[PDB]
Symmetry: C11
C-alpha cells in the first residue's frame, strides 16, 4: 500500500487525512514544524491526504511542493 513523504519547509504545516468511505471530511490534522518529516500511508481510514503550508512532498509519481 502506498505512502507519501512530507517534509515541512516552515512551521505549522498541516498534513490532513480525509476519510475513506461514502462521507469525505477531515478526521485528523498532523501539525509539522519546520524540518519535520512525516511518512504517511493510505489506509483503511484515509483515502485522500491534503497538505496545507510550505512543504517538500515525495510520492511514487515524483517530487511536488505545496505553498502556504
Amino acid at each position: 500500500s502506498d505512502f507519501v513523504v512530507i517534509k515541512a519547509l516552515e512551521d505549522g504545516v498541516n498534513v490532513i487525512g480525509l476519510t475513506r468511505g461514502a462521507d469525505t471530511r477531515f478526521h485528523h490534522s498532523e501539525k509539522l514544524d519546520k524540518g519535520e518529516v512525516l511518512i504517511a500511508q493510505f489506509t483503511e481510514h484515509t483515502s485522500a491526504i491534503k497538505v496545507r503550508g510550505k512543504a517538500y512532498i515525495q510520492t511514487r509519481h515524483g517530487v511536488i511542493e505545496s505553498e502556504g
Copy 2:
C-alpha cells in the same frame, strides 16, 4: 489502488469524485486554494475524478495540467 496528485495553481480549484457503480454523479467536491496539494485515491466510492480550475496533476501516466 492508484492515486492522483493535484496541486492548485490558483484559488478555488475543485477536485470532484464521481461515484463508482451503475450510476454516475458527483459525491464530493474538494476545494483547493492556491498552492495546496491533494493526493487522492480511487476507492470503493470513487472511480473517476474530475479537476476544474488551474492545477498541476501527476498520475502514473506522467504530468498533465488542467486550466481555468
Copy 3:
C-alpha cells in the same frame, strides 16, 4: 485497475462509458469543457470508453489525441 486521463482541448468534449457485459451501450456521457481533466477507471460497469471531441489522452500505452 487501469485508468485513462482525458484533458478537454475544446468545449463539449464527451467521455462516454460503455457497459460491461453481454450488452454494449452507452450508460453515461461526461461532458468536459476546455481545460477540464477527467481521470477515469475501467470498472465493474464500464469496460470500454469512447472520447468524442478534441482532447489530449494518456494511457498506459502513451499519449493519443482525439479530434472533433
Copy 4:
C-alpha cells in the same frame, strides 16, 4: 485486464468484439467516426477484437495501423 486504444483516421471504422467461449462470433460492432478514440478492454464477453477501417492502434506491444 489489458486494453487496446483505437483512434479512427477516417469515418466508418468498426471495432468488433468476438465472443469468449467455445464458440466464436461477433457480438458488437462499435462505429468510430474520424478522430474519435475508443479504449476497449478484454472482458468476460470479449476475448478477441477485430478492427476494420483506417485507424491508429496502441497496445502493450506498441503501435500498429489498420487500413
Copy 5:
C-alpha cells in the same frame, strides 16, 4: 492472459485457434482481409494460435512476420 496482434498484409489471411486440452484441433478460423487487424487472447478454449498468409504479428516477444 497474453494476446497477439495480427495485421494482415494480403487478403485471405487465416488466424486459427487450436483447442485447449488433451485434444488438439482447430476450432475457429478468422479470416482477415488486407489491412485488417485482429487482437486475440489466449483463453480457456484456445491454447495455440496459427497464422497462415502474409501478416505482421506482434507479441510480448517482439515482431515476427508470417509469409503466404
Copy 6:
C-alpha cells in the same frame, strides 16, 4: 496466464511437438507448419515441454533461437 513460444517455419514440414505433462512423458500432438506459417503455442495443463524439428525461427521470453533441420 502461462508462457508461450513463437515458431516460424523457415522450410516445409516443420513439426512442433507437444510433450505430455505429468508422470508419463510422450508426444501427444505434432503440429505440421509449412514454410512461412507461424504457431504461437502455450505451455498448458497438457503440454509441459515443446520440441521443434526442422528449420524454424523461434522466440521465447529468453530471446531468439533457431532450430536446424
Copy 7:
C-alpha cells in the same frame, strides 16, 4: 510491506509511530543517538511515521533529510 531507513545525525532523534485506524496518536517513540540506524516497517499498528531531529532518511521514493528544531 514498505520500510523506511532512518540514520540519526545528532543525539536524541525520535522516530514516532502513529497508530493505524480511525484514531491517530503516537504509540511509540524510538529514540536514536548520533550514528545509529533504525529500519522500520509500516505495520498493522503503525500507518504513519514521524521523524523529529536531524536524520538522513531513505524510502522507496529516494533520500530526504529531517532537520531539528
Copy 8:
C-alpha cells in the same frame, strides 16, 4: 513457471528430467539430434534438469553451453 531452452549442437544430446520429491532419480530422458530445440518447463514431476552432450542453453539467467 520457469522453462529452459535446449538447442542440440550434435546428435544424441540427452535432456534428463529429475524427479521432484524426497527422492531423486531420472524419470525421463529426451534425446535431441543436431539442430533440434527442446523448450522444457519445471513441473509437478521435474524439479531439476540435466543436459549431457554439446548444447546451447537459454535460461532466465542467461546463456550457458554444455559440452559433450
Copy 9:
C-alpha cells in the same frame, strides 16, 4: 519478504530486533564481530531492526552506514 544485510566494521556491533505488535521493545540482540555479516529478514516477530556500532548496511533502498 524484505531483508537487510549488516557487515560489522568493528567488534561488538549490535543488531537489535524490535517486536512486531501494539508494543515495542527489543526481543533479541545479535552481536557481530568485525568482518561478520548478518542477513536478516523482517518477520512475524520483528518489524523494526536497529543497528548500533560501526556497520556497512545494505537494504533494497541502497547502502547506509551506522557509526558507533
Copy 10:
C-alpha cells in the same frame, strides 16, 4: 515457481548437494556431474539449500559465481 540455479561442471566429479528443508539440516542427495555437463536445479519442498563442491561455473538470479575444487 521457485528460483533455480545453473551449475556447469568445469571438471569431472563435481557434486551438487541438496540440503533438507525443515527443522533438520542434512544432505539428502548428491548429484555427481562430469566435465561439461549442466544441471539446472530448483529450490523445492525438499531442498532449501544447495552446496556445490568441485570446479563449476554457477548462475543464479544474483549473477555468476564460480566454485573451486
Copy 11:
C-alpha cells in the same frame, strides 16, 4: 522466497541459520572449505543467516564480503 550465495574464500567458513519465531537461536552451522559454494534460502525455519569467516557473498542487494577471524 529470497536466497543468499556464499563462496568460502578460506577453510572453515560457517554459514549459520538463526531460528524463525519468538525464540532466536542458532539451529545449524554449515562449514564451507575454500572454494565451496552454498546457496541458501530463507525458510519457514531460518529467518536470518550469519556468516563467519572470509567469504564472498551475493544477495539481491549485491555483493558483500565477510572478513575472517
